[PDB]
Amino acid sequence: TQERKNQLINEFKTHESDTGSPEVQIAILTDSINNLNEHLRTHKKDHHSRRGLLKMVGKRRNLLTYLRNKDVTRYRELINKLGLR
Amino acid sequence: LLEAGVHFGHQTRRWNPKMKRYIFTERNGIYIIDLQKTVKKVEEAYNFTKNLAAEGGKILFVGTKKQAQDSVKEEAQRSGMYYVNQRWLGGTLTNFETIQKRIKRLKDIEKMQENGTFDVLPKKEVVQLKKELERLEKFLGGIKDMKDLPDALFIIDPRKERIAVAEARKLNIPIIGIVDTNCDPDEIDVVIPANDDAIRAVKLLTSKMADAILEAKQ
Amino acid sequence: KVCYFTSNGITHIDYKDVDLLKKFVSERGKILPRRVTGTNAKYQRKLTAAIKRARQMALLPYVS
Amino acid sequence: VMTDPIADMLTRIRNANMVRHEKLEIPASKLKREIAEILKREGFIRDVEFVEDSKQGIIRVFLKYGQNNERVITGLKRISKPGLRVYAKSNEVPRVLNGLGIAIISTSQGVLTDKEARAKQAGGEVLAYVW
Amino acid sequence: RIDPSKLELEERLVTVNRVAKVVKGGRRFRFAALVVVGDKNGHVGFGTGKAQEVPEAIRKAVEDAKKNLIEVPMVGTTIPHEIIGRFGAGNILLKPASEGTGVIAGGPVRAVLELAGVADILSKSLGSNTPINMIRATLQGLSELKRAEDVAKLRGKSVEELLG
Amino acid sequence: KYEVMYIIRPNIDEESKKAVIERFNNVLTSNGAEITGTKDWGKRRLAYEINDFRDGFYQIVNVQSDAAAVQEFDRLAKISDDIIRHIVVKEE
RNA sequence: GAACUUGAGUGCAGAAGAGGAGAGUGGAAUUCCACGUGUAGCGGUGAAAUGCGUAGAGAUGUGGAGGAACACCAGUGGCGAAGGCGACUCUCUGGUCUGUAACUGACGCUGAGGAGCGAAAGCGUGGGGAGCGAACAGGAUUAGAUACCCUGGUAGUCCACGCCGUAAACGAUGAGUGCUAAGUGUUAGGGGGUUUCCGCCCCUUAGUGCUGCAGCUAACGCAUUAAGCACUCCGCCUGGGGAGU
């Protein structure tokens, strides 16, 4: 906590004041999904966290479609950075 | 303009949003009436009640609280009109003919105990006359010599007496009245905001309205 | 009634306060309800959590 | 969400009628401004005023109760809902309560009324009955 | 306002129901009549009456009917505008008609609109067929009607700025 | 942050009690779990009997760790017979 | 195509919660076991009887084993999408609410089909069995008693994984949003007017109860936690039975 999110902000800043700006937000979502999925490999009987993971995947996919419809090259460079394919 | 009065006016938490145009709010929790919206309204009530007692419908004065008893009674017996000092019998106005029957019965029996024959049995005068005179006098009051439908109606509390106000509003009698902060100003035709349980405020207001009708008969 | 913890301004009840918890615990050993001790909802929750933890360290009794 | 704001302003006027409120704030798009200008010029309203602000702006309405307690507007209705839009030709423009009510109809030359669109002989969206 | 009943009235009836109440002994019956009363100059009303007999029930119904009267606008001997009256799962629309059609209406609606003096009505009941709620539905639809002069005075307007 | 409060059984000599505390501190230094404060209430009367005993020694160790030698303390306190109790409370 | 920030979300800061999953620990009590006390009953019922008991029971003291639920808190209290979730602690982890102003700048909602969760009973495999307990046995009641009552007691209830995928799965009330009197408790915040406080009052959120106006309704009732007034989307109904065949 609180070095990881801040490094991901400072890594995926496109302006200085960017804490919104869907690349920061998708990147926090990706690493939280990854932590959660490793949690599910530890804990398979947890279902409410699975619901939260499904909410995260839905948020992140809709933000991806918003980036696809907004800026093509930024969307492709984000995909190539995160590897989210 | 505080002419003589003392009324900030009444209720705590049980209060009506239909008086938002009239009241203030004290930190006591008991509500204070805006007297600028009282003086103009009692002035128009004064004028309209002068007009009604100038035309010739007598006036009803109705008060059915322990505060209201001596005030409404003495004020209507000062002005000479028709009062209700005890309970309001259900249907004095809409049920008018059967109340005319019972008041004519009271008139017959109160004439009989001083002009007519007083010697019938040893106790038919007790068991009939006295027992019967008591209830009928106590409840039929100064509307005894009524002879006719009234024109208007002056009450002391609409929340205490929703039945009389209800069939008054049914019979389309215009009504003057003091209301409270929990009462409904939509129901009263002529709305006066003041205190309905401070005896000096109700004596003052019945005094003002009886003086209004007393300046009218000339 | 009146709350204790709002009066003395004290926050997290700190299980180590065995005498204060001993004031809140009843004569037999039970936790007194909120309408007896007069606390808040939040402070009654932290009180009962405190009493159960202090029971598991024998700072408070179960049965007496 | 909110799915159309014109129907929502019509119900906001209707609820202010049924409560017998005297003023209304409505979030004021341009077609709402033109609707309230029509309802001003047709005497359903006393006066209408705009508050241009930062969020989206406010339009305030002063409901007209001309006599004792008489709602000049009895009811409102929206015809073209977002999901069934309704369009009338000029030989089908509805005249409502035959003359005593009206229909706000925004054709290609201005957001018009009944008589205005009838005298210009054009049709478009049919977006309010006003009684 | 309350309509003072001093007019000439025609007082014809819709229904008399026979209407029971069960006691220890058995059924005790009454007759509940509802009667529509009004002149054909724009004043209508109706009333209910209950008695052990039929004619005293019709008496009480005619008295209570003279008590409750309504007014109706006769703009061009028709009604001014189409309206739906909606008293409680009885819904009845009323259209103005042309001048030759006559009152096209079912029984209690027809009784109301003929004893109203309104001559040319298209109408239809879109609900339940009890006489009481249909008459209540018609008078709900006839209470909300509007005169063109009064609505022109309401809109700060003139009649010809509405009617044309 | 953790408050690590445990009860030493009473029938224990003082150097052996130092050997118990040195042992479990050696256990805590398997993490890096620094000892930011110590406290011994001493022999207190327990609210209820544990095995046969009315009384026991209390030990408070304030730790700021990575949640590992706390768990090593848990497994070593479920095994060591010279302990009456233990709790670890997340100090928040 | 360009802007904006209200809708949505991120940022920072707290706050509350039986939200979930994994592991560990505790104290009553029930049962069982051994020993001391000791003797004739115990148990149970509307009445009794089967049972348990001198081979020493029931009661009682100490000790041990084992399972399951977590008294008091506890509350029209909280959390969760629903099922549901009440000891405690740690490990991981989901969501909410509040204060804004830092950011994004319409990125939102609903959602057939699909994917998942899904009480209880049930099924498969391996364990487990203290209480309870279908089935089953005896005794009673009874015309009969495949029942209610009593004494026993199998599967099951428990755990691990896999399947079923159903409930009066209920608020018999889909989700979202806006508007439309009040009073009053309460849950978690925030802010103001004196007091550092204690505390009172006021204001504002989001959630949760009751009474209640307009409005609705066939009525009962709902009423800002709608069953009002509207818009979006989905599911469902078109007489009862046959038949959820």
Swiss-Prot record, chain B:
SUPFAM superfamilies in the cross-refs: Ribosomal protein S2
PROSITE patterns: RIBOSOMAL_S2_1, RIBOSOMAL_S2_2
Molecular function terms, GO-annotated: structural constituent of ribosome
Assembly behavior: Part of the 30S ribosomal subunit. Interacts with BrxC.
Name of the encoding gene: rpsB
Keyword terms, alphabetized: Ribonucleoprotein, Ribosomal protein
Biological process per Gene Ontology, one example term: translation
Name of the protein in question: Small ribosomal subunit protein uS2
One GO cellular component term noted in the UniProt record for this chain: cytosolic small ribosomal subunit
NCBIfam families listed in its UniProt record: rpsB_bact (TIGR01011)
Keyword Ribosomal protein among UniProt keywords: yes
Family designation: Belongs to the universal ribosomal protein uS2 family.
Curated annotation (Swiss-Prot), chain C:
GO biological process: translation
Keyword rRNA-binding found: yes
A molecular function GO annotation: structural constituent of ribosome
Regulation: induction: Strongly expressed during exponential growth, decreases 2-4-fold in stationary phase, part of the rpsF-ssbA-rpsR operon. The operon is induced by DNA damage by mitomycin C.
GO cellular component: cytosolic small ribosomal subunit
Domain of life: Bacteria
Keywords, sorted A to Z: Ribonucleoprotein, Ribosomal protein, RNA-binding, rRNA-binding
Task of the protein: Binds as a heterodimer with protein bS6 to the central domain of the 16S rRNA, where it helps stabilize the platform of the 30S subunit.
Similarity field: Belongs to the bacterial ribosomal protein bS18 family.
Subunit structure: Part of the 30S ribosomal subunit. Forms a tight heterodimer with protein bS6.
Protein name per UniProt: Small ribosomal subunit protein bS18
Gene name of the record: rpsR
Curated annotation (Swiss-Prot), chain D:
MF annotations from Gene Ontology: rRNA binding; structural constituent of ribosome
PROSITE patterns, per the entry: RIBOSOMAL_S8
Keywords: Ribonucleoprotein, Ribosomal protein, RNA-binding, rRNA-binding
Keyword Endoplasmic reticulum listed: no
One of the GO BP terms on file: translation
Coiled-coil annotated spans: none
Cross-referenced SUPFAM superfamilies: Ribosomal protein S8 (SSF56047)
One CC-aspect GO term: cytosolic small ribosomal subunit
Subunit structure: Part of the 30S ribosomal subunit. Contacts proteins S5 and S12.
Recorded family membership: Belongs to the universal ribosomal protein uS8 family.
Protein task: One of the primary rRNA binding proteins, it binds directly to 16S rRNA central domain where it helps coordinate assembly of the platform of the 30S subunit.
Protein's name in the database: Small ribosomal subunit protein uS8
Organism in which the protein naturally occurs: Bacillus subtilis (strain 168)
Curated annotation (Swiss-Prot), chain F:
PROSITE patterns per record: RIBOSOMAL_S6 (PS01048)
InterPro entries (alphabetical): Ribosomal_bS6 (IPR000529), Ribosomal_bS6_CS (IPR020815), Ribosomal_bS6_sf (IPR035980), Ribosomal_S6_plastid/chlpt (IPR020814), Transl_elong_EF1B/ribsomal_bS6 (IPR014717)
Keywords: Ribonucleoprotein, Ribosomal protein, RNA-binding, rRNA-binding
GO molecular-function terms, A-Z: small ribosomal subunit rRNA binding; structural constituent of ribosome
NCBIfam families in UniProt: S6
Role noted for this protein: Binds together with bS18 to 16S ribosomal RNA.
Subunit structure: Part of the 30S ribosomal subunit.
PANTHER family cross-referenced by the UniProt entry: MITOCHONDRIAL 28S RIBOSOMAL PROTEIN S6 (PTHR21011), SMALL RIBOSOMAL SUBUNIT PROTEIN BS6M (PTHR21011:SF1)
Name by which UniProt lists this protein: Small ribosomal subunit protein bS6
Organism name: Bacillus subtilis (strain 168)
Name of the gene encoding the protein in the UniProt record: rpsF
